[PDB]
Every structure is written in C-alpha cells, then in structure tokens.
Structure 1
C-alpha cells in the first residue's frame, strides 16, 4: 500500500546487495557533511567536530534492531534540537498497530542483513516507504543524535535518520512542532489545547484519547528567547516537547486524585514535585497501585497530579487518527 520514496525498493535493493555480497550505500542520502546540515551543523561548524559515519556492525559485536520491544525508553535525545520529533516517536510506541507500520519489525543486523533498513512515514497525505543505509553519525564511539537506553539497539537511531532523509538533513529537524511528528507517524490530525482555557472535561478527554491510541504531547511556554530550554526549580524544561504517556485516577487521602504521566525525550531530568518517582505521595496510595504505576528510575518519565500539570504546563496536543468517527 505504501509508495516508494524516490522509487527506492527496499526488498529489491536488499536482495541485490545480498547477492553481490555488498552493503547498501544510499545514493539519495549519503554519509557526507550536507546530510548533517548546512549551518549550525554545516561543513565549517565547530559542532561537527569529530563526527564520523559508522554502521552499527562497524561499532559493536552484536548490534540489534529491536531489544525488549520498540518502546519509549528507546528514545533518548542526542545533540540535535528535535525534541518535538522524539516526543512523537515515544508517543507512537504506545499505539501498537501504528508502531508496527512505521517501524517494520522484521529487520535484523544478522540474518538477511545488507546494510539497508526501511520505515513508513505519512508524507503529504500518503504513506511512503523510506529506505536508509545504516551509516549513522558517531562521535567518541557513540551515537551523536538519538540513541536508546540500550546501547546496542538501533531502530530509533535509524528512524530518526529516515526522518532526516525526507527533510534533507539532520539540521532541518532542529526546532519544530510535535504535531508535525505526530501526524507524520499516524496520518491523524492534531487538536491543540491552551491549558489556561481548557474544557472542564479535559482529563476525561485525555483518558479516552490515550485509551484509543491517539498521540499526546505537552509543553511549557517560553517568555523570551533566554527562556528556551530553561530548567525550572522543579526540573521541568521550558520550550521543550514532552510525550503524555499515561493517566490514571487513584484513591488518595480520602479522595480520588487524577494523575497524568509524561516523558521527557531526554530520557532524564524529571519533575521533583508531588507524584515524582521518590515523592512521599506514593506512601498513601494502595500498594498494588503503587506497584503498577510508580517506577523509581531516572528515565525521563514521571507522574504529576492533573492539578499540578494544569498549573505547570501550558499546552497540550492530541493527534487523533479519526477524530470525527470515534468509539
């Protein structure tokens, strides 16, 4: 069903390379300075100091495409300002059907390997199949850009490369809107909410949207350019895309408290207030709810009360696949 981006035929290219005993080299997006960028990542930029291009099979003994599932902990931002895109990838992982379309799971660095991978993207109103070779930007032996918490897992590095490819360069991804990423992974359409002027049933809207596999993100407005990427006292990040990854009501101090879970695509730096990983609120919830919801791990993911979320965050976006035809 997906059309072939630039006519490149993943399976025909793979089979040819396997037959000729060679590794795929992508003519359409070569491992050259212009694929990194033009200005901040351009040929004469100090920020490209030391960057080389290496396949995962040139880096480690047993590179893997997917380890323990393709999940949101596999999305840890690198040195590129594509937080909006990475938040969208992390949200995508919660919708198992769309995840398996965007990320074809039958790819490997072992059996069948020819140095070529492919992904599906929604582009200009249609699904397209995008190939990449697996040369990736490396500095000091590590991925420069997105990487997994598992150092030998490469699906998200390669998906980010495919998204750079359709944009012409990695630097073209620097600075953006989460809604673009949401839509390019789902074919859905984004609704935007100003949390100061939110409907009274917003929490129920969020619950139903997560349940149906929509993709959700949130952010804190900046007051000025100097506010960009500022870290607040309670370790939220301003001007920065977060994934909304969960929502649950718990019984707490005789009331029902609505909680919301979100993930910083840095994979680190989390809220320190109520419902944070080591907060004392967890001592007064049910032991089963505490076990189900709370994970003490610096992974970028944490809970907040909905009250605090509405106090600290400024906007929420919800990308629904079929917003006029729900269940």
Structure 2
C-alpha cells in the first residue's frame, strides 16, 4: 500500500472533515498564490490577479469525478506550460491497470464527499499517496489549467493539481520532459529514439510497446529557437509534447501502409498532411478500415504515415513497464 506523502492520510482526513461538517482545505498546498507560482504566476503578476480558487461543487450543480471513463479526451491543456505532463496523462489512460493505480477508485462529489481527493505517484523512489483539496484555479467560472472536453468532469484537473503539489506549484510544471511524467506514473524504464536515426524495426518496437500498454510520446525539436514559427506549415506544434495513441496498418490502393496515431494535449490543432482527418488518402482505403480508424473531429488526435512521422518528428519517448 502506497505510503502517505507528508503523512497526510486521505481516509482519515476525509472522515474527520465529514464528522466536523466541513470541507478539507490543504495546509500543504493551500488555495493561495504560492500554490500557483512564483514569477509568471507570482503574488504580483497579471495572471495571478485574475484567478479565484473554487471547488467544482461551487461551479456546477452536478460535478463528476469521472464521466464516461477516465480517457484521453479528458485531457485538454489550459494556460500552463505543462504539455509534457498532459501528454503523459493522456497516454496513461490507454492502460487501464496503471491508470487506476494513479487514479484510485471510489472518489465522488456525492456520497462521502468532503472536498478531498487523492492520487498515487511514483516519487522519491516510492509509490506515494498524495491528497489535494478540490479548490481549483478558475477565472470567470472556468478552469484556468487542465480541463476535460466533458465540462462537468474533474479527475484530470484534480490530478494535475496533485502533480503541481508534489512539484511545489503549478508554475513549477512550466516546461519539462514527457518521460519524467511517464516515470512518475509507472516507476518504469524510459528510453528515447532519434527519429532521424530510426532503427529499421522501430515500427515493430512501437507496435509492441502499445500492445503492452507502455507509454509513448513524441516531439519536434526547435533547432533554431523559433525563427520558423512555433507551428509548422502543416500545423504541427514544435517544442511540444504529443501522446502517441495508436499504430495501425491500412490497405491503401491495395498496398499496406503503416500509420501512427497521436494526440495534441491541447485537444485541438492537428496535422494537415497526408492521413489527416480531411485528407484524400482515406478515399483509397477500404471503407471498413476507414470507418474503424478515421474520426473526423477537431479533437487534437490524428494519423500520419510512419514515413511522414519519422520525417516530421525528431524524438520518440517510450516508458516500458513490468
């Protein structure tokens, strides 16, 4: 059983709050500016000034911890530089077992609610249970940071808060390494691949990792700084963590083509090249494959051929489990 971060005891705190007729407020990560940050989110910063801390039970009549499962569409980045963390959470959702280690069952805004939630992370070389109160940064009634495509769903917001907690503040999550979040969700072994020097069996390596529920992410290095724009001509985001979410082979004009699926943690802004949602390539695969694989939605998720993937992206990270 996970050891308690800082000795904070989720069930004890919950039961005592319920008995005392109050909602939990977390002394270890309180609803004040120092939990937001120190510079860009510091006490005197423009961003801090516009934020008010509110519980989901203050925002909505019917807040829900999980709605239609804890899935990758639940991860929509807000106004924070934590794409790396969010790419990792989105990948985490594809492995049911590890997902629900990190996100324990039995948490609700109804029976037994007392304004406290908990999550398990691999931290300090231990599996640790981290509590948070459910006060969340908001502006004009909406979450400022991560939110779900399902507007009344809060598990991912609360998880991002717990991860901020262990790192000291939300601002502490601005800029990072996808593999660091991968490790913090698994205790696993991380490896990376230079896509410009990809081994000839990389696609098989990817297939196998996805099969076993390993976590995969990818990115495009900015080799100049940003003097060819943050976004590429074909609508990829440079210096930005994507989750790799599938790998499947289609029959394109009678010939197998290896495809790879990825997801922008923004929940929007997608590749517009071959195999993109509106591309013509889909017209030349058999309708069953097209229907299984293609989803015409601005949801941040899209396909690329593996060929185009290894040309466009520069880095692949894989976190392998037990």
Q: Which TM-score bucket, shorter chain as reference?
A: over 0.9
Deviation at 1:124, TM superposition (A): 2.0
Alignment of 1:60-71 (within 5 A): 60-71=60-71
**Contact 1:244/1:263, CA 8 A, preserved across alignment:** yes
* Kept after mapping to 2: 8 A contact 1:67/1:153: yes
Distance 1:50 1:86 in 2: 23
Q: Does 1:169 align with 2:178?
A: no
Quote how far apart the aligned CAs of 1:225 are: 2.7
* Partner Cα separation in structure 2 for residue 14 and residue 113 of structure 1: 8
Deviations 1:207-248 (A, max 9, x none): 000000000000001023325971111110000000000000
Partner Cα distance (2:226, 2:248) in 1: 35
1:45 shift after superposition: 1.0
Backbone CA RMSD of aligned residues: 1.0
SS state at 1:257 partner: strand
Q: Is the 1:87–1:241 Cα contact (8 Å) retained in structure 2?
A: yes
Q: Report the equivalent of 1:181.
A: 181
1:267 aligns with 2:259: no
CA deviation after TM superposition for structure 1 residue 188, in Å: 0.6
SS at match of 2:138: strand
**CA–CA separation in structure 1 for the residues paired with 2:225 and 2:282:** 37
Query: 2-side partners of 1:264 and 1:316: how far apart?
Result: 14
User: 1: CA distance between counterparts of 2:175 and 2:222?
Assistant: 14
Aligned equivalent of 1:242: 242
Alpha-carbon distance in structure 1 between the residues aligned to 2:199 and 2:229: 28
Tell me the CA shift for residue 105 of structure 1.
2.4
1:229–1:237 contact (8 Å) kept in structure 2: no
Structure 1 residue 54, shift from structure 2 partner = 0.1
Moved more, 2-11 or 39-48: 39-48
Structure 1 stretch displaced more, 223-232 or 84-93: 223-232
In structure 1, distance between residues paired with 2:128 and 2:280: 48
Instruction: Give the unaligned 5+ runs of structure 2.
Output: none
Write the distance in 2 (CA, Å) between the matches of 1:253 and 1:165: 52
1:154-303 superposed matches below 5 A = 154-226=154-226, 230-303=230-303
Give structure 1 stretches of 5+ with no counterpart. Answer: 323-327
TM-score normalised by L of structure 1: 0.97
- Asked if structure 2 preserves the Cα contact closer than 8 Å seen for 1:227 and 1:239, the reply is no
1:23 maps to 2:23: yes
Tell me the CA shift for residue 254 of structure 1. 2.3
Distance 2:55 2:164 in 1: 17
Displacement after TM superposition at 1:295 (Å): 0.6
Question: 1:234-284: per-residue Cα shift (whole Å, max 9, x none)?
Answer: 110000000000000111112110000000000000000111111111111
Write the deviation string for residues 178-202 of structure 1: whole angstroms up to 9, x where unpaired: 0000010011111010001111000
2:153 maps to 153
Q: Who is 1:325 aligned against?
A: none
Distance 1:207 1:2 in 2: 32
Q: Deviations over 1:77-110 (max 9, x none)?
A: 0000000000000000001000010011210001
Deviates more, 1:81-90 or 1:101-110: 101-110
- Alpha-carbon separation, structure 2, partners of 1:227 and 1:184: 34
Match of 2:126 in 1: 126
1:139-166 per-residue CA deviation (whole Å, 9 max, x = no partner) reads 1110000000111000000000000000
CA contact (8 A) 1:229 1:239 kept: no
Matched, 1:142 2:148: no
Q: Using structure 2 for the length normalisation, give the TM-score.
A: 0.98
Q: Deviations over 1:39-88 (max 9, x none)?
A: 01101111223100000000111000000000000000000000000000
